[PDB]
Subunit: 223 residues, 4 copies
């Protein structure tokens, strides 16, 4: 435990944290810049290397933290995130699709993990998630039922919006958000199915009512 505690002193050290938070904010500022074609035609490679540096440093740091915690680590939501967020950043710039190449910017999310209050907020938000799964389940069931009916009621003449179980899923979500649901979807639809309003108005009521209730439940049970 000499080398160990010698490390634990660095890892648990203040300098360490602040230093990582420093690279987060420094790297974060560099990715908004590496966004400019112009800037990349100047300080282009600079930013590229600096990004390679930061990631190395972050791998070292992720390793050091594994020593000091080991099993305790792979049971920490926050460390697990930082783990997978750096691994993605590790996948070679080439091969497969550029998703990984873009998901890379997900590292700036470590400024939520590497900073309390942010952790508190995020924790507080998520705390509610579990209490809504009963409703979130009821909803997804509802959506599935209707998406199926819409695919087989309008997918024929309106393939763009309902030709597929998934196309219907997307359209029904757009209707839920109320986004041009009438001018954009139901009016056109009615030019062929005069009673389509019988399918959609009720759908907008249930989904709305639930959403509203879902919130009134949270507010109400507390105070």
């Amino acid at each position: 435990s000499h080398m160990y505690l010698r490390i634990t002193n660095i890892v648990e050290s203040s300098f360490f944290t602040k230093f990582i938070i420093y690279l987060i904010v420094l790297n974060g500022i560099t990715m908004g810049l590496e966004t400019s074609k112009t800037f990349m035609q100047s300080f282009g490679v600079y930013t590229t290397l600096f990004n390679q540096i930061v990631i190395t440093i972050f791998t070292i740091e992720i390793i050091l933290r594994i020593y000091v915690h080991r099993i305790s680590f792979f049971k920490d939501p926050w460390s697990l995130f930082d783990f997978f967020v750096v691994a993605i950043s590790l996948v070679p710039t080439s091969s497969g699709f550029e998703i990984l190449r873009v998901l890379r910017v997900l590292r700036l999310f470590r400024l939520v993990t590497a900073v309390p209050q942010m952790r508190k907020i995020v924790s507080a938000l998520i705390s509610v998630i579990p209490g809504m799964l009963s409703v979130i389940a009821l909803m997804t069931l509802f959506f599935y039922i209707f998406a199926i009916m819409a695919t087989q009621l309008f997918g024929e003449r309106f393939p763009e919006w309902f030709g597929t179980l998934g196309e219907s899923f997307y359209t029904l979500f757009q209707v839920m958000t109320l986004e041009s649901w009438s001018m954009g979807i139901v009016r056109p639809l009615m030019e062929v199915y005069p009673y389509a309003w019988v399918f959609f108005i009720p759908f907008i009521f249930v989904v709305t009512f639930v959403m509203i209730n879902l919130v009134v439940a949270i507010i109400v049970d507390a105070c």
Copy 2:
């Protein structure tokens, strides 16, 4: 109570319920695939056969439950649903409209009945319904008053959106959801009726205020 009790311990059995819930999730998955033209051609008839089976099994099951409960059953909302939902699934594939054929997917709602907690949610939600009928009535009255005025104020030059008492009902509901209410309806309407904004702004106010007051009456009462 010889044959009766034999029937009851089965109907009232754990196996029974779970077996019914299993057919729900199986038929449910099957109707999702039955949505695919490809699968329709590559695994169709079997799916068609499976559906007929499920419904048969459900009729047997619905009968067994009326034995074990009789008059108790017809007074249970949850069973009444399961009743009418399977009945709809009974009407022959042909004849009349295909809605009865598309309405069958409504059986997947038995998973709300056959599963507690789901029952609780749906119960919790509906519990509020009656506590809003006063407002829901006031609103519907409001809508009727305005739908009539708009039909006779704009239906002449704007048949599509207000030519009928019901077309006005639809448009006013769209205005309530605030969907394209200005670019879509009022701006165009004003190209002919410069003061039309005198009709719609107040309407959007009343309807909005009431909606909000409605939700505020709900959570406030809780704390």
Copy 3:
């Protein structure tokens, strides 16, 4: 007080009320019908006379109520409404504009006055109005300030939406409701005024924040 109390017995009588509520619902049903060109080409005049009858009866009834209450009447919000709602219905079908001819249907609103619970609801809703005048004032001030700035910043090149203090008032309200504020108004506007987003985003924040607060105040102060 013999003839008087003899009247007061009729006016305060149950039969009376129910009888007026009967004509309300009967007349209300007739105005939704008198909405159909077809129906008016059949039972056309019938409905016309029946509407004349109802209004006469309502004038008698309004007179009888003045006797029984006198000064107490012109201090009753509900009676005052019924008063002005019938007077409008009294103005000759001809002369001036058809507004009066259409405002006529405002009488069906007497089913809110002529029925408790409806009265309660409406009373409960309005109860809050006075407590929001401080905010409603702040808002209108805000709107006036911005409507002025927008008229003089965009009315030049965008006269349809801001060429007038009032055109700007309408557009700013549409922006508040968030109705195609971006695609419809700001994007187009930015094709000429690159920083227009500096005027509108802040406007959407203030207006939104306030609206939200305005409600959180109500909810919160109670329980």
Copy 4:
């Protein structure tokens, strides 16, 4: 305290305040008319003259208040506003941009300062601001992360909406307000990026959930 106290009893006087509030509502009305080209031509110069007068009077008044308070004044938010608001009104009509010329109508905001209750409202509102900076920070971080990813995922083929870190910022805010988010942006985007819905639906979820959780944290804490 000879000249000082003479100055104070005037500045601290009822007359003074009311006189200032009177000029606000007068100048306020005047700027509404100054909005009319007709009035501009039919009553213009007088209006122009009146405005110069008002501002002079307000400078005198702003000076008198710094005497009576001195260092106390510069530490008062309400007076600081009135200060900077009149200063802007001082910059010569010409030179630079006309914004300083349009920003003058911001003086009508002194009616929020010069009138209590208005001060209270604005104070009550702002009181909450600090109690949300944790979330407002988390959100802005979120927006930055996504604005960067979208600029490099769609800015190439969709310059208008995502070609710049800031164009993406604008579009993502529009998506947040849910304005044309589907018909307007995602549907079109999918014509090239079929999985783009994987980016936007989750974004609309996080942003929505947080917004709601935000308002729920506010009223709950109150009861």
